[PDB]
Each structure stands twice: as structure tokens, then as C-alpha cells.
Amino acid sequence: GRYIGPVCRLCRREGVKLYLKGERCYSPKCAMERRPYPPGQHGQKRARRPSDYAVRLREKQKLRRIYGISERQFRNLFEEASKKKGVTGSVFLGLLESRLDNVVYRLGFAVSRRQARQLVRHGHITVNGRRVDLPSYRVRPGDEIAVAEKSRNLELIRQNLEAMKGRKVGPWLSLDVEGMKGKFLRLPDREDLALPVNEQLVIEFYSR
């Protein structure tokens, strides 16, 4: 089961703020806000020049932790990326960005990814009409991701979909806040995203 445990601690081990909570991570409290040092009894102690390896490990752990995906699944995507034509780095990101659970989150249907995930597992999500509770489901270009008719009235749904009014969204995505529909226009360009991650090191980590 995708991690599930103290999360605003991973932010602390990566020395960078990851959004694994949506809000709370915006209001002075993602911990990174005054307490940016690693978790644990030695968190405040001076760090030692990390090994080329350490650097590469933490980088992958960053990107991977951002999407709350497992090593098993993360690796399988990367291997797929390698094989495919074109720059593995971007292509990899493109694939991570195509996970239904992620897209749900991108469209704002949920505040964080872990929430977006649950929304999927519980059928509150629809792809071209049909229900789909597979958070790893790969959204293709042209697919319409909406909210289940029966779920459109849920308290949590309104709140999030409300806050989405006026809010802009991914240049590769499009949100019709009305009927609570969204459309995966195209695979995001590396230029499209802006994750605190140097995918180049990630490729290197697996090249070892």
C-alpha cells in the first residue's frame, strides 16, 4: 500500500517542500516552514558532502515521493520510458503525469494526490463516462475526466470544485468547472512541468 504514514517528514528529508497535503502545505505548516531540517534526532546536525550516489538516490526518492508511487511501479514506468522513442527523461515525466490519480489532482478534483487517489478507488471518478477506480490507469490524449454524477453532490467535491472557479490550470489540461468535466489535452512537455527535480540524475541512478 503506497506508503501511508507521516508525510510532512519526507518533505523534510528532501530539504524541499513536496505537496503531499495540498493545503496546510500552503499555510505556514508544511513543516518546511520553520523546521526544514531532516527528520530524526540528528536532523539539525551539519551534513557531510553526500556521495555522488547519495545525491542521485535522494533525487529519485524526491520525484518518486512526489507522486506517492511505489518503487515497483516507479521502476516499471522508467523501464517503459527507456524503451520508448525519445528522451527518456521527459517521456518518463509524461507517463507519471498521465496517471489518472495524478490527473484527478491536476484538474483540482482533489487537494492532494493521496486524496485524488482515494477519490478514484471509491468510484467518484469517470473517464469518458465509464467508471474507473484504478489510480494507475493511464489517461490518454482526448480523454474526458469527470466526476461521477452520483458524486457531484458530495460535500468534499463541491468545496474543491468550487475553489477551482477562476483558477487557471495546466496548459496541457482543460477544466470545465461547470459539469465538473476536464480534458487531458496532451502529454505535458518537460517545459510544461516545474518539479524540483533534475530527472537527469534519476536516469543516472538507474543506470548504475
Partner RNA sequence: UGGAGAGUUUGAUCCUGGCUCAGGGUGAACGCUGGCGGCGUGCCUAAGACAUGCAAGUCGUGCGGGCCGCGGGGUUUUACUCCGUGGUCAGCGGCGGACGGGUGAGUAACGCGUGGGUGACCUACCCGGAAGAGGGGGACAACCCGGGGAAACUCGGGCUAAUCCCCCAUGUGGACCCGCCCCUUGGGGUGUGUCCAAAGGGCUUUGCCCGCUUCCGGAUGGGCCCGCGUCCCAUCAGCUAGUUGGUGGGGUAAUGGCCCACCAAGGCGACGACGGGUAGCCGGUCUGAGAGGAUGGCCGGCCACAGGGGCACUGAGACACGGGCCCCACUCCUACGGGAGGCAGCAGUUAGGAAUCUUCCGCAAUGGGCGCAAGCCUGACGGAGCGACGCCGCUUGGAGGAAGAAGCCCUUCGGGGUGUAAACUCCUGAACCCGGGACGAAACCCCCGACGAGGGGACUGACGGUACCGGGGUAAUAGCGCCGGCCAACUCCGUGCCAGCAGCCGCGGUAAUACGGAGGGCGCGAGCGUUACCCGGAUUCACUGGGCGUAAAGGGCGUGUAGGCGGCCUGGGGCGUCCCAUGUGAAAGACCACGGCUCAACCGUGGGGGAGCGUGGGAUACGCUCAGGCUAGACGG
Partner RNA sequence: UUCAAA
Partner RNA sequence: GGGGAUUGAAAAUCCC
- Give the nearer residue to RNA in terms of CB position, either 61 or 174: 61
> Which is nearer to Zn ion, 22 or 89 (by Cβ)?
22
Nearest to 95 by CA among 193, 198, 178: 193
Contact range with Mg ion by CB under 5 A, out of 30-38, 86-94, 150-158, 195-203: 86-94
Can you read off the three cell numbers belonging to residue 161?
A: 470544485
Nine cell digits for residue 194: 516545474
Shortest gap between Cβ of 192 and RNA (angstroms)? 21
**Residue 105 CB coordination number (10 Å):** 23
- CB of 39: closest distance to RNA in angstroms? 4
Q: 71 is in the binding site of which of Mg ion, RNA, Zn ion, none (Cβ under 5 to 8 A by kind)?
A: RNA
Q: Select 25 or 175, whichever has its Cβ closest to Mg ion.
A: 25
Specify the stretch interacting with Mg ion by CB under 5 A; choose among 19-27, 85-93, 98-106, 139-147. 85-93
**Can you give the binding site for Zn ion, defined by CB under 5 A?**
8, 11, 21, 25, 30
Q: Is 88 in the site for Mg ion (CB under 5 A)?
A: yes
- CB of residue 96 vs RNA: minimum separation in angstroms? 13
Q: What is the nearest approach in angstroms of RNA to the Cβ of residue 6?
A: 4
112 binds Mg ion (CB under 5 A): no
CA atoms within 13 Å, Cβ hemisphere of 48: 3
Helix, strand, coil % (nearest 5) of the chain?
40, 10, 55
Residues in the chain, overall count? 208
Q: Which residues are annotated binding-site positions for Zn(2+)?
A: 8, 11, 25, 30
**Rounded to whole angstroms, how far apart are CA atoms 138 and 51?**
36
Residue among 98, 131, 130, 136 at smallest CA distance from 117 = 136
Instruction: Give the separation between CA 181 and CA 67, rounded to whole angstroms.
Output: 22
Q: Give me the residues that bind Mg ion (CB under 5 A), please.
A: 88
